[PDB]
Design a protein around this ligand. Structure first.
Ligand SMILES: [Mg+2]
Ligand SMILES: [Mg+2]
Ligand SMILES: [Mg+2]
Ligand SMILES: [Mg+2]
Ligand SMILES: [Mg+2]
Ligand SMILES: [Mg+2]
Ligand SMILES: [Mg+2]
Ligand SMILES: [Mg+2]
Ligand SMILES: [Mg+2]
Ligand SMILES: [Mg+2]
Ligand SMILES: [Mg+2]
Ligand SMILES: [Mg+2]
Ligand SMILES: [Mg+2]
Ligand SMILES: [Mg+2]
Ligand SMILES: [Mg+2]
Ligand SMILES: [Mg+2]
Ligand SMILES: [Mg+2]
Ligand SMILES: [Mg+2]
Ligand SMILES: [Mg+2]
Ligand SMILES: [Mg+2]
Ligand SMILES: [Mg+2]
Ligand SMILES: [Mg+2]
Ligand SMILES: [Mg+2]
Ligand SMILES: [Mg+2]
Ligand SMILES: [Mg+2]
Ligand SMILES: [Mg+2]
Ligand SMILES: [Mg+2]
Ligand SMILES: [Mg+2]
Ligand SMILES: [Mg+2]
Ligand SMILES: [Mg+2]
Ligand SMILES: [Mg+2]
Ligand SMILES: [Mg+2]
Ligand SMILES: [Mg+2]
Ligand SMILES: [Mg+2]
Ligand SMILES: [Mg+2]
Ligand SMILES: [Mg+2]
Ligand SMILES: [Mg+2]
Ligand SMILES: [Mg+2]
Ligand SMILES: [Mg+2]
Ligand SMILES: [Mg+2]
Ligand SMILES: [Mg+2]
Ligand SMILES: [Mg+2]
Ligand SMILES: [Mg+2]
Ligand SMILES: [Mg+2]
Ligand SMILES: [Mg+2]
Ligand SMILES: [Mg+2]
Ligand SMILES: [Mg+2]
Ligand SMILES: [Mg+2]
Ligand SMILES: [Mg+2]
Lengths: 138, 101, 117, 59, 154, 113
RNA sequence: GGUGAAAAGAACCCCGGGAGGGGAGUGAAAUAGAGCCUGAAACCGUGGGCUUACAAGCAGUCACGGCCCCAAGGGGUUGUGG
RNA sequence: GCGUUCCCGAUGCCGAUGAAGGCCGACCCGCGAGGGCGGCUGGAGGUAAGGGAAGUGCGAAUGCCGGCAUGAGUAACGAUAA
């Protein structure tokens, strides 16, 4: 008989930004990071993983054209309208989300993935006025 | 010291003195000694070398104060008008006492 | 001779009830709401003991992989590096080395890529 | 016995759950002058009474 | 069902009451109702093959004798039906009352003698039967008796 | 220590009095008195009386001394209900249940340091 | 339909208009006190333990982790995850 | 194969040093139906081996009888002559 359990770790954050990347192609890696999928002391039920921080938001490439080609229905008020929003908008009118959303649909659906999304901390920087230990990853 | 022996199609890593279930063995009596194969020395100041099935002769010395144990269970298959609660599996356990490496 | 139901039943039920103690509502207060439950509970356990097995199969791979990925290699490559090398060992499970005594693992990795020189 | 009707016995849960707001509220009484007894605020209780106003009987 | 003492009226209109459909309160699913397959007074006898009825008494006497518990008596000092006298007899007769004794004799006086001993089954000779034989641990009978039993098959 | 009361077969629905009762669960005998004294319900007059007697007992019978006692605990149980027929429209007729209650109250001594 | 072997069926005091109770007392027994043996289940309560107010469910099952009564184990509960 | 009632075994054997039934238990024994053990309750019956007999096993028949729930502290409280 065996067992393989980890005690109370210590959230080892990460500061990051590759605005030269394609969100998604990036987001994944971020998500992968979020939940401790890289750190070999796994426990899908625990909630241990990097406290990922992304700076210098946007500036993100995005392959082919999403000049209103990428729509964000996401919003369905309730009476008769399902308000749609193209990329351009979010970029101009407060971006960040752009990447945020990309991360949500990569993190699991439970109160955990919900909790994990609480880790991610993206800003439209550069500048992450919120850290005491940014371990910028490459 | 470390070590990884295989028994009952299953392989465990043992130390210098301990054990649990392992599965019925013709080691008929309780106070008896048996030696199961080994798979990775243990890295300690004594070694740390594995290899192809590590059949390097060396093995683990195991005694064992056992007696075919069992355990609750209850296996109730059930379809539909088909019920078969007709199952109690306790599974025979075989307690061992790992000695030396 | 008239054989009354007498006791029989009551007992026949107390049994099933005990079995279903701690359940939700009538689910654990009804000689039958209980039954119906204990049924699901039936396969559930059974079907799961089958899952649990292959549950850890996966539960480990992650470790292995998310462990030997630190030494620049795929769990995919890794494994193969062993099969074609020789190692009816490690037992996706016993790759618990990747955690406890990671140096034991190290040699393995290097051992791995070896077979693929 | 007619048109709209309960579609399910209400669970002992949601039953009590519905009563959460049933708890009674203690009345509000106060010292009261003369007698060290109790009376509710802004009230003339039949014992000592009031001043300039009648009540029961005293001396 | 019909054996019961209720009316035959049809308790309910049968079609627009929601209530289950029903006959008379005599219906066996009505508590008060009549039993379905209850027991009816019936006989249980049958005619066991004579040639067997006897070959059976044979194995009876037999067994008991093979175990040496068979005893053909003759000397009976017991008179005017007296428990004492009988008990006395058996004593020196080799029957202290340890094993059950099937006593069979054409002597009603002896009959009375043990007619009351808890460890004895007194039975006229013509009444011999595998049950009682088997029922008791020791068979003891008058010579006369053993003859008739023999006459019953030589 | 503790003084009991219990007044069975009162004739008022349990649910109904349980209310006045929870209103005094664990309190100074001195206070509860006032409370019930001005609690507008019918249970009052019932739980009143009882609680008042638990007091009596407490003293007269268990020498506990009024001043130091309160409401250790109290509660109410269903009694055997009286079924009654209620003529319903179109000759339906229903059975109304005049429920009944068992009010128990147990005093106790507060402290002594 | 069934108090108890026997009415010995609850004097007297206390609360209360009564009913009911609390002591006292009878009895082997009063959770044998009177539609009173035994008294199951549904159902209504009081007290205690674990547990819940960002989360979506045939109500369970598998797995780890935490809290509460005995200790290379077990029970009870259940926070996530499957 | 397991249980229920009954008869033979019984002028027997258990039984107030507590039967039957009930309420608990993480014990033991059976693949299972069940069978034992132990602890509280109960207070007078029970019934081995091995056999024989049946009114012999319930979750559903808008089943039947009884009890208790839900709706619900909701509608109502029976002429608006006060
Ligand atoms: Mg926007
Ligand atoms: Mg076994
Ligand atoms: Mg079955
Ligand atoms: Mg039946
Ligand atoms: Mg299913
Ligand atoms: Mg595998
Ligand atoms: Mg409740
Ligand atoms: Mg007729
Ligand atoms: Mg008639
Ligand atoms: Mg007709
Ligand atoms: Mg209908
Ligand atoms: Mg009748
Ligand atoms: Mg009849
Ligand atoms: Mg003839
Ligand atoms: Mg006789
Ligand atoms: Mg005879
Ligand atoms: Mg007073
Ligand atoms: Mg009306
Ligand atoms: Mg009319
Ligand atoms: Mg009596
Ligand atoms: Mg009694
Ligand atoms: Mg009673
Ligand atoms: Mg009696
Ligand atoms: Mg009870
Ligand atoms: Mg509580
Ligand atoms: Mg939450
Ligand atoms: Mg929200
Ligand atoms: Mg919360
Ligand atoms: Mg929830
Ligand atoms: Mg569901
Ligand atoms: Mg669980
Ligand atoms: Mg779950
Ligand atoms: Mg009978
Ligand atoms: Mg006789
Ligand atoms: Mg005896
Ligand atoms: Mg019986
Ligand atoms: Mg108990
Ligand atoms: Mg017992
Ligand atoms: Mg008993
Ligand atoms: Mg038998
Ligand atoms: Mg039989
Ligand atoms: Mg029948
Ligand atoms: Mg049925
Ligand atoms: Mg209907
Ligand atoms: Mg009914
Ligand atoms: Mg109703
Ligand atoms: Mg309503
Ligand atoms: Mg309303
Ligand atoms: Mg109204």
């Amino acid at each position: 008989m065996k067992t393989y359990v980890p005690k109370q770790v210590e959230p080892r954050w990460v500061l990051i930004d590759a605005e030269g990347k394609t969100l998604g192609r990036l987001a994944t890696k971020i998500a992968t990071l979020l939940r401790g999928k890289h750190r070999p002391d796994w426990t899908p039920n625990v909630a241990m993983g990097d406290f990922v921080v992304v700076v210098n938001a946007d500036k993100i490439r995005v392959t082919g054209k999403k000049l209103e080609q990428k729509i964000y229905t996401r919003y369905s008020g309730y009476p008769g309208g399902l308000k749609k929003i193209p990329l351009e908008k979010m970029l101009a009118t407060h971006p960040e989300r752009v990447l945020e959303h990309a991360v949500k649909g990569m993190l699991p659906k439970g109160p955990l993935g919900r909790r994990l999304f609480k880790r991610l901390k993206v800003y439209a920087g550069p500048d992450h006025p919120h850290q005491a230990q940014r371990p910028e990853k490459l | 010291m470390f070590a990884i022996v295989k028994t009952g199609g299953k392989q465990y890593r043992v130390e210098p003195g301990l054990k649990l279930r392992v599965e019925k063995l013709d080691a008929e009596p309780g106070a008896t000694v048996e030696l199961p194969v080994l798979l990775l020395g243990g890295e300690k100041t004594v070694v740390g070398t594995p290899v192809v099935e590590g059949a390097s002769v060396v093995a683990e010395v195991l005694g064992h104060g056992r007696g075919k144990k069992i355990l609750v269970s209850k296996f109730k298959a059930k379809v539909q008008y088909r019920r078969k609660k007709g199952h109690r599996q306790p599974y025979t356990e075989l307690l061992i006492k790992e000695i030396r490496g | 001779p008239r054989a009354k139901t007498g006791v029989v039943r009551r007992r026949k039920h107390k049994k099933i009830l005990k079995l279903a103690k701690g359940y939700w509502g009538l689910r654990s207060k009804s000689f039958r709401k209980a039954r119906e439950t204990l049924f699901a509970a039936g396969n559930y356990a059974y079907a799961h003991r089958k899952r649990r097995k292959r549950d850890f199969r996966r539960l480990w791979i992650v470790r292995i992989n998310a462990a030997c990925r630190q030494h620049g290699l795929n769990y995919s490559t890794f494994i193969h590096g062993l099969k074609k090398a020789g190692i009816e060992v490690d037992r996706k499970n016993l790759a618990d080395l990747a955690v406890r005594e990671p140096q034991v693992f190290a040699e393995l990795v290097e051992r791995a890529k070896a077979a693929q020189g | 016995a007619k048109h709209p009707v309960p579609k399910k016995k209400t669970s002992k849960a949601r039953r009590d759950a519905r009563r959460s707001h049933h708890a009674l509220t203690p009345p509000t009484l106060v010292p009261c002058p003369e007698c060290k007894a109790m009376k509710p605020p802004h009230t003339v209780c039949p014992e000592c009474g009031y001043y300039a106003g009648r009540k029961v009987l005293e001396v | 069902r019909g054996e019961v003492a209720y009316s035959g009226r049809k308790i309910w209109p049968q079609k627009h009451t929601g209530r289950a459909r029903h006959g008379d309160i005599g219906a066996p699913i009505f508590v008060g109702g009549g039993v379905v397959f209850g027991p009816k007074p019936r006989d249980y006898s049958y005619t066991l093959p004579k040639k067997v009825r006897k070959k059976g008494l044979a194995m009876a006497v037999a067994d008991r004798a093979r175990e040496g518990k068979l005893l053909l008596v003759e000397a009976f000092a017991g008179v005017n039906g007296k428990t004492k006298e009988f008990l006395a007899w058996a004593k020196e007769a080799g029957l202290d009352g340890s094993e059950s004794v099937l006593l069979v004799t054409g002597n009603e006086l002896v009959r009375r003698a043990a007619r009351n001993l808890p460890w004895v089954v007194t039975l006229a000779p013509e009444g011999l039967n595998v049950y009682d034989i088997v029922r008791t641990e020791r068979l003891v009978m008058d010579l006369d008796a053993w003859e008739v039993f023999q006459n019953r098959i030589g | 220590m503790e003084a009991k009361a219990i007044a069975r077969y009162v004739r008022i629905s349990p649910r109904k009095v349980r209310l006045v009762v929870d209103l005094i669960r664990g309190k100074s005998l001195e206070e509860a008195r006032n409370i019930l004294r001005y609690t507008n319900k019918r249970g009052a007059y019932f739980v009143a009386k009882v609680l008042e007697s638990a007091a009596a007992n407490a003293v007269n019978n268990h020498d506990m001394l009024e001043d130091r006692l309160y409401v250790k605990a109290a509660y109410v149980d269903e009694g055997p209900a009286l079924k009654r027929v209620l003529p319903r429209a179109r000759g339906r007729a229903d059975i109304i249940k005049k429920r009944t209650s068992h009010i128990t109250v147990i005093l106790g001594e507060k402290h002594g340091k």
